[PDB]
Design a protein around this ligand. Structure first.
Ligand SMILES: Cc1cc2nc3c(=O)[nH]c(=O)nc-3n(C[C@H](O)[C@H](O)[C@H](O)COP(=O)(O)OP(=O)(O)OC[C@H]3O[C@@H](n4cnc5c(N)ncnc54)[C@H](O)[C@@H]3O)c2cc1C
Ligand SMILES: Cc1cc2nc3c(=O)[nH]c(=O)nc-3n(C[C@H](O)[C@H](O)[C@H](O)COP(=O)(O)OP(=O)(O)OC[C@H]3O[C@@H](n4cnc5c(N)ncnc54)[C@H](O)[C@@H]3O)c2cc1C
Ligand SMILES: Cc1cc2nc3c(=O)[nH]c(=O)nc-3n(C[C@H](O)[C@H](O)[C@H](O)COP(=O)(O)OP(=O)(O)OC[C@H]3O[C@@H](n4cnc5c(N)ncnc54)[C@H](O)[C@@H]3O)c2cc1C
Ligand SMILES: Oc1ccc(C(F)(F)F)cc1
Ligand SMILES: Oc1ccc(C(F)(F)F)cc1
Ligand SMILES: Oc1ccc(C(F)(F)F)cc1
Lengths: 550, 550, 550
C-alpha cells in the first residue's frame, strides 16, 4: 500500500513503498497494514491513542505489521536498519491509560507481535512455571490451564483485566494481586531480538540445552531451553534482564513466568473503612502486617468512587457536572454498604494458618471505629468483592472496565506515583492529588496497591474524549501532579507516551546521570535508533531532543 | 614507591611512578601500598590469591590503594583513564574459594574500598532496611544493631562466615539462610562510580531528595536519598541495577539492603538422612514444601564430610592419603550421630503457625526410613546445628572456616553449579561430580543450598596449597567438571578468577550472543577498559582474547 | 529474471534485478540462472545440497552464473563489490558428501566456472606436467591424453570417481591413489582472480615469459607462463599458494599439476584381512612399509561393507532396518571372498624391483593368520580389485558411486578425521566411530587411505534423504563424532558446509589463534566480504558470527 497519513522522520515516500513492498513479500498482504477508529477493549486499535489526550498527528503509526514468527521479526529489523525506519513493538496493545498501542514517534511501524506469535510454549508442573509468546493473554493461559486440567495444580496472577498480554504486562513491570503480584520479579529466561537483529536468551537461557537427535537442525528461535532456564534467573556474569523492562533495548519474543502452586486453601475478604481520614490509621496498620506475612498477596485500598464507578456511571448517582462533594461521597458509600476507603485482601493456605492470620488482621483493624468485615457470600451479587475474589486467585475478569465509562465519552489516563507504606505519607499524597483534581473540575478516583515496603497509588483520571477544554485541563493536571509529587519526593513508576519525557526528567539526581548512562547504552546497542525511540524518555542520538521531547 | 614486581599492560615504570605519586598525593602514603604472604581470614591478603591454584605471576597486583572517600575514588578513576591503568575494586577481599582479593589482570591496582569507606549509613525501622558502605562486614552490622538495641526489631541475613562485606556479597549475588537469603534480590538503591568517573544512583535513588536548608551545598556522594530510594527498587524506565552485579560495569560505593523484622518466633532444626542414596527422596520431598512455604528460608542439605571437617581435620578421622571409602563415611556418620546427608532448616513466626508446618515437615520426611529429628538442645555443644541455629536467625559466626583445614595446607576452590529441586537431577549432578573427584584423588565435600525452584550445589574442593601435583589435578578436576556439567545442561552461578573465561564460554547459545551483547555494553561505558578487565570473562577491546583468556 | 526464492543478506530485489540485468548483459541469458531438483552425478545440481542433511532455506543459491572467460569473472567480481553480493565459485560442483555445489550463505550467486572455462591448456612431456581450467574433469584429461596418444608417456592420478574437476579437487586437498596421490602437493603455478578483481599468478608464474612477437597484445589471462612456472612451485619470497586451498581468498582460474611418467611396470593387488581386530596388526605392518617405499602409492584399507555396497544395496544382503551384526558382516565377507578389512595396493616400475618389494610385502603381511593375496585376474569380473586396478594407474571409473545407494534414498555425508599410522590409534578411532554409528541406527561404512605418516579415515554415513528422523540422527552423529574425535586428539581434514564452523572451532589452540589470524588476512584482501563468506568457518567482518555460524 502506497500513501500513509504520516511518514517516519527523514524517510521518502518511495522508500516507504519500497520498504512496505519488501515486508509484504515476507509476511504477506494479510499481515502488513498501511494507514492512509478508536475500536474497543475487545478489538484494540493498533494505529493511534484511542483515549486521546494530545492532539492529532501525535502518536500515529504509518503502518501496522504482524510478523508470523521470529524469523520475520529478524527480517523486519534488518529492513528497518537498512532504511532507518522506527519500529514500535506491542504484544496485545491493551496499554489503555498509558497510550494503548500507539507509537511514541508518529510514522513508526507498529509491530504487532501477538497476532501470529500466540503460543503457550510450555507449562511445567514440577518447576512451577510457564513459557509464553507475546500473543498469550491472561485469558488464553487460563483457558490453557483449564483445558488440560492444571488449575488444581497451578494458579495464575492477573491484573484487573483479563485481556492483557502476560509478557507485555511483565516487561512493563505491571502489578497483580496474589503473592506472585510483582510480575517482573516472577520472570526467568527471556528471548530477545536485539536492534542489530541478533537473537539473545538471558540468564540460564544462555546455557544451551545439550545436543540430542530429536532437536538437531532447529532454528535458534525454535530450540528448547536448558533445564535451569526458567528456574534460576541470574545465569552467570552481568544480570542484563532489567535492561529489557520499560525500555527500548530489544524486542521480546518469549518469557518464562513463575506460577504459584495451588496453596491448599483460600479466602478473600473486604474491610470497610468509614471515614476519608481513616486512610491514615489503616495504612499504619497495614505496614507491620505487610512486612510480617499476615498480608501475603498485594491487597488494595480502593476509594469509594472506584467501586461506585464499577457499578454504574456518574449520571446514575448524580446529575452534577462538577465533582461530587464529600457529603455525596458518604451517601454513595451508605447506598453500596461500603466505606469511603475499602480494603480488599486474601488469605492463602491451610485453614489452621488462615484462621490465625485472619484473627490477627481483624484484631488490628478493629482499632478503627465502625470497621466492618465481609466475605464474598455476605455481599450482593454485583459486588466488587465477588469480582476481586476471582482476581485474587488468578481468575481473569472484565468487570473493572466499567469505571472507564464514569463520564459520557470516558477515556482514562493513569497518574501513578509510589508512596511509603505510612499513613502520613499516603495522606499527604492523596491530599496533594485530590486538591489538583478538584482544580481541574474532576472527581478524584483511585486505588493504592500494597507492595511490601511501598504502595503504588493509581490515580484514574477519567474524562470526555470529545471535550476539548476538559482534555486541556487533563493535560494541565497530569503535568502539575508530576511536578508537585517530585517536589514532595515521589516519582511515578509507569506513564503514558505524552508524559514519558517529563517523568524521566524528574529522575535527574546528579545532573541527570541516570538518563545520560541509559542513552550511552541505547546508542551502543542501537546505532541506527530504530527500536522504539523515546520509550521512557530515552532517545537515540539521531532524534534531536529539541525536536522530539514533550 | 618505585618498582613493583609486575606492571599493568603497556605501562612504563616512569608512568607507574608518576601515577603512584599522584595517588599518594590524594590519599596519603598510609593508604597506598606498592608490591615490590597469604595472611589469614582475620587479616585477608590484598595482593594475590592465597589459596593458590594457578602459578606465580597470575593475579598479582602492582599496588593496593585505599580511598578515604568517594571523591578519592573519582580522582583515582580519573588517573586510571589518563594513564590506562586497570583497577580491581574489592570491599573486604574475603572472596576465598573464588580468588580472594586478587585481580584478574596482573599489575592491576587493587582498590580497597572497605578500609576507609566503612560506615553503616542508615538503619530504618519503619521501612525495614539498611544502607551500607563497602567496608561494613556482617559482623559490624550485627554489632551496630546490638549497640543500638535493634535486634529486637530487625534481623540480618548472613552467609556462613560473618567477616564478609554486606555489599560485596550482595553484588556477587551470594546466598544467606533466612527468608531474606537471596541477597541480591533484597537490594534497593545503589550508588556507583562509573568508569567515566561520574556518580550514578539507581532506581528511586535517581529521584533527588527535595532541597532543604540543612542539606544545601553537600557533595553528591554525601547527599541523602529521597523517601522511596530504599523501598522500591525499580524507579522508572530501564532497570539497570543488575548490570552492576558480577560485572565490571562500575564501582559500587553504597547499597540499600532490606532487613527482616523480628518474626516473633523461631526454631531451627536438623533432619538426619541415613543413606547416601537418600538424597533423591529427600530432594523430591523438599520440592513441594519449598514451593508452598513449609520451607520459607534457605535450608541446606550437607554432606557428612562437610560437618565432619567442621569438627576436625582428615588426619583426626583417618590416616589414609586417598579418598575415604563409602564404608568410612558411614563410620564417621555414626560417630557424629549424623546421616550421610543432613538437612538443616528453620521455622519462623508465631508458635501456632510453626507447629502446623513442623508437623507437615515431620510427616513428609518420615517416608524415609531411619530419619531422625533434632532441635539444637538435643545435640552436643560443638554441633553444627548449634552454629547454624545462629546463622539462620542472622547471627554471624566463624566456625565453618575449619573445614578449609581438612588437608594439611588446605586451600579451597568452589565448583558451584545449579541443579533442579528434583531427586533425579540432584543425584545425577552429585554422581558426575563425585566420580571426577575420585579420579583426582580427592574426597567429595559439599552442600546443596535450597532456593525456591533451584538448588546451588557448592562443591568444596580442598587441597594442599604447597603440593604441586595435587594443584595440577585440582586444575584438571575443575575444568573437566565445568565441561561435564555443561554437557548435562548445568551451568555454574559463580567462579574463581582462573575459570571465569571457561565458564562464560559455557553460556554460548546462539554463537555466544550473551557475551557479545555484554562486550558491546562494556566498551561503550568504559572506552579505556580500566574497570576490572576480564571479570566474568568480559574483556574490553584493548585486551586481546588470544593473550588474556584462560 | 526477476524473483529469486532467497536474496543475499541486505540486498534489495531492485538491486538483485539491476545486478542480474548487468550480468546477463556480460555473459548472455544462456549463462545466467535465476532460482525462482537434486539432479544426478551425471548432471550435478548447482542450486542447493542434493544429499540434504539440513533443512530448507539453508545453502540455497539466488542464481547460478557461468562466466565465458576470465574477463567475465573479473567483471562479475567488480559487480559483486559494487552491490555487496556474495559469490560461491565451483569448478564442476561434484563435492557430494561435502555439500555438492551449494553455497554456505543462502542467496549467494553460484559461480559455475567449469561450464565455459573447460580447456586442457597444455600437456608438457619433458617437464611432465599439465595445465588446466576449472571445467577439466579427470575423465576429460584422460580423453585428451588418449586422443593424442600420451598414455604411453604420462599417467594421471584420480580419486574414486572420474567426474570431479582436476583443479577443484586439488584446491580442496583431495586424495588419489598412485604415488602422485597428494593432489595439492603436485601443483605448481596457479592463476587467481582476487576479491579486488585483480589477476595474480603464483610462484614462478609471477616471473613473466619474455616478450616475443607472437604473444604481444594478449590479455593477461591469455598470456603464456615462463619456463619454470609449472616446474618449481616456490618462486621467490612468501609462498602464498596454500592461502588458496580450502579457503575463500580467491577464485582459481588455472592450475599446473605434475603428472607421473609411465613407470615401466605396474601390478595392483588385494590382501584380505580375516578378522575385525586384524586392523590393528595390519596398520602396524603398514607403518614401516609406507615409510620405506615398499608402499609407494596411497594404498587403502577398506571395510567389508564399502566393497559389499559397491556390489549391491543393503536389501540385497539383508532385510533388517537396523545395523547388520558382526556375524552378518562375517557372512558377507565369506560370500564375496573378502576379509572384514581389505587392503588394496600397487607396485610400480621394473619387474625386478617389483618382485623384491612384493616379497617384502607378502612376507610382512603373512604374520596375520588367514591372510590371502590376489591379483585382478584371480578375482571375479565385478570385483572391486578390477575397478581399483584402473584407479591405481590413473584410469577413471564410476563404479564406486554405487555404495551411495546402500539405502533406499541414499544420500551420503563424509566424516573425515586423520589418524596416526599405528594399529592402536586406528583401532581407537574406529571403535569410537563404530559405537556412535550404532547409537544412530546406522551401519559403519568406511575406508582408511594411507598417507606417509598419517591415514585419512573416511567414514561414509549413508542415509535416506527423505527420512526426517534419520536426517536428525545423522546431524547428531556428525556433531557428536566431531567432539568425540577432538577429545581424543584427532581433527578432520575436510567437511560439509553445515559442519565447517564446528570443525574450525576444534582447531582452537591458544584461544583460537589460527582462526583469528585467518580472519585478519580475509578482511584485508576482501573488504566487502564477497568471496565465499563462511568457507572453512572463515567469516568476513560484515557477517555477524551470532547470525551465521552453525
Ligand atoms: C481498567 C484497567 C485496569 C488495569 N489494571 C491493571 C492492573 O491491575 N495492573 C497492571 O499492571 N496494569 C493494569 N492496567 C493497565 C494495562 O491495561 C495492563 O497493564 C495491560 O496488561 C497492558 O497491555 P498489554 O498487556 O496489552 O500490553 P502491550 O500494550 O502490548 O504492551 C505495553 C508496552 O510494553 C512494551 N512491550 C510490549 N511487548 C513488547 C515486546 N514483545 N518487546 C518489547 N517491548 C514490548 C512496549 O513498550 C508496549 O507499549 C489496567 C488498565 C485498565 C484500563
Ligand atoms: C567457609 C566459607 C563459607 C562461605 N559461605 C558462603 C555463603 O554461605 N554464602 C556466600 O554467598 N558466600 C560464601 N562464601 C564465599 C565468600 O566467603 C563470601 O561470599 C564473602 O562475603 C565474599 O567476600 P567479601 O564479602 O569479602 O567480598 P569481596 O572480595 O570484597 O568482593 C567479591 C567481588 O565482588 C566485586 N566487588 C566487591 N566490592 C565491589 C565494589 N565496591 N565495586 C565493584 N565490584 C565490587 C569484585 O568482583 C570482587 O572481587 C564462603 C566462603 C568460605 C571460605
Ligand atoms: C563415491 C565418492 C567417492 C569419492 N572419492 C573421493 C576420493 O577418492 N578422493 C577425494 O579427494 N574425494 C573424493 N570424493 C569427494 C568429491 O566427490 C571429490 O573430491 C570431487 O572431485 C570434489 O568435486 P568437484 O571436483 O566437482 O569440485 P567442486 O565442487 O567444484 O569444488 C569443491 C570446492 O572447491 C572450492 N573451489 C572449487 N573450484 C574453485 C575455484 N575455481 N576457485 C576457488 N575455489 C574453488 C569451493 O570451495 C568448492 O565448493 C568422493 C565422493 C564420492 C561421492
Ligand atoms: O499500572 C497500574 C497498576 C494497577 C492498576 C489498577 F488500577 F488496577 F490498580 C492500574 C494501573
Ligand atoms: O558461593 C557460595 C555459596 C554458598 C557457600 C556455602 F558453602 F557456604 F554454602 C559457599 C559458596
Ligand atoms: O575426502 C575423501 C577422500 C577419500 C574418499 C574415498 F572414500 F574415496 F576414499 C572420500 C572422500
Amino acid at each position: 500500500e502506497f500513501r500513509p497519513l504520516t511518514l517516519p522522520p527523514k524517510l521518502s515516500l518511495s522508500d516507504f513503498n519500497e520498504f512496505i513492498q519488501d515486508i509484504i513479500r515476507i509476511v504477506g498482504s494479510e499481515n502488513v497494514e498501511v494507514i492512509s477508529v478508536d475500536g474497543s477493549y475487545m478489538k484494540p486499535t493498533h494505529t493511534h491513542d484511542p483515549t486521546h489526550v494530545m492532539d492529532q498527528d501525535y502518536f500515529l503509526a504509518s503502518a501496522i505489521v504482524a510478523p508470523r514468527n521470529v524469523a520475520d521479526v529478524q527480517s523486519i529489523v534488518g529492513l528497518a536498519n537498512k532504511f532507518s525506519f522506527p519500529l514500535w513493538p506491542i504484544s496485545i496493545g491493551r496499554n489503555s491509560g498509558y497510550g494503548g498501542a500507539a507509537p511514541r514517534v508518529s510514522g513508526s511501524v507498529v509491530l504487532d507481535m501477538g497476532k501470529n506469535m500466540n503460543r503457550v510454549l510450555e507449562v511445567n508442573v514440577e518447576g512451577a512455571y510457564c513459557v509464553v509468546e507475546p500473543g498469550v493473554t491472561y485469558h488464553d493461559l487460563h483457558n490453557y490451564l483449564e483445558a488440560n486440567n492444571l488449575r488444581d495444580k497451578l494458579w495464575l496472577d492477573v491484573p484487573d483485566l483479563g485481556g492483557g498480554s502476560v509478557l507485555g504486562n511483565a516487561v512493563e513491570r505491571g502489578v497483580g494481586y496474589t503473592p506472585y503480584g510483582d510480575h517482573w520479579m516472577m520472570h526467568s529466561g527471556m528471548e530477545v531480538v536485539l536492534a542489530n537483529g541478533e537473537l539473545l536468551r538471558t540468564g540460564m537461557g544462555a546455557l544451551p540445552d545439550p545436543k540430542r537427535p530429536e532437536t538437531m537442525g532447529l532454528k535458534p528461535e525454535d530450540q528448547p531451553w536448558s533445564k535451569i532456564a526458567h528456574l534460576f534467573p541470574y545465569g552467570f556474569g552481568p544480570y542484563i534482564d532489567g535492561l529489557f523492562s520499560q525500555s527500548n533495548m530489544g524486542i521480546v519474543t518469549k518469557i518464562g513466568i513463575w506460577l504459584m502452586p495451588n496453596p491448599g486453601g483460600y479466602q478473600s475478604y473486604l474491610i470497610t473503612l468509614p471515614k476519608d481520614g481513616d486512610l491514615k490509621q489503616a495504612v499504619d496498620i497495614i505496614r507491620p502486617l505487610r512486612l510480617g506475612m499476615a498480608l501475603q498477596n498485594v491487597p488494595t485500598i480502593r476509594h469509594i468512587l472506584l467501586d461506585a464507578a464499577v457499578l454504574g456511571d456518574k449520571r446514575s448517582y448524580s446529575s452534577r457536572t462538577e465533582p461530587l462533594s464529600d457529603e455525596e461521597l458518604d451517601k454513595i458509600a451508605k447506598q453500596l454498604n461500603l466505606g469511603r476507603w475499602n480494603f480488599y485482601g486474601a488469605l492463602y493456605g491451610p485453614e489452621p494458618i488462615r484462621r490465625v492470620l485472619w484473627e490477627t488482621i481483624k484484631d488490628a483493624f478493629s482499632a478503627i471505629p465502625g470497621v466492618k468485615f465481609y466475605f464474598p457470600e455476605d455481599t450482593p451479587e454485583n459486588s466488587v468483592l465477588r469480582v476481586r475474589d476471582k482476581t485474587m486467585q488468578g481468575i481473569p475478569t472484565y468487570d473493572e472496565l466499567k469505571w472507564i465509562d464514569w463520564l459520557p465519552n470516558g477515556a482514562h489516563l493513569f497518574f501513578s506515583p509510589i508512596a511509603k507504606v505510612s499513613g502520613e505519607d499516603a495522606m499527604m499524597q492523596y491530599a496533594v492529588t485530590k486538591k489538583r483534581c478538584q482544580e481541574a473540575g474532576l472527581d478524584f478516583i483511585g486505588t493504592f496497591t500494597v507492595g511490601m515496603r511501598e504502595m503504588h497509588h493509581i490515580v484514574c483520571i477519567v474524562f470526555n474524549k470529545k471535550d476539548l477544554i476538559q482534555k486541556r485541563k487533563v493535560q494541565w493536571l497530569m503535568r502539575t501532579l508530576i511536578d508537585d509529587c517530585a517536589a514532595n519526593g515521589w516519582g511515578e513508576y509507569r506513564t503514558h507516551l505524552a508524559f514519558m519525557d517529563q517523568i524521566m526528567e524528574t529522575y535527574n539526581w546528579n545532573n541527570s546521570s541516570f538518563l545520560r548512562f541509559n542513552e550511552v547504552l541505547k546508542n551502543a546497542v542501537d546505532p541506527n535508533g530504530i527500536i522504539a525511540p523515546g520509550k521512557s524518555g530515552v532517545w537515540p542520538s539521531q532524534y534531536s531532543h529539541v525536536t522530539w521531547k514533550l
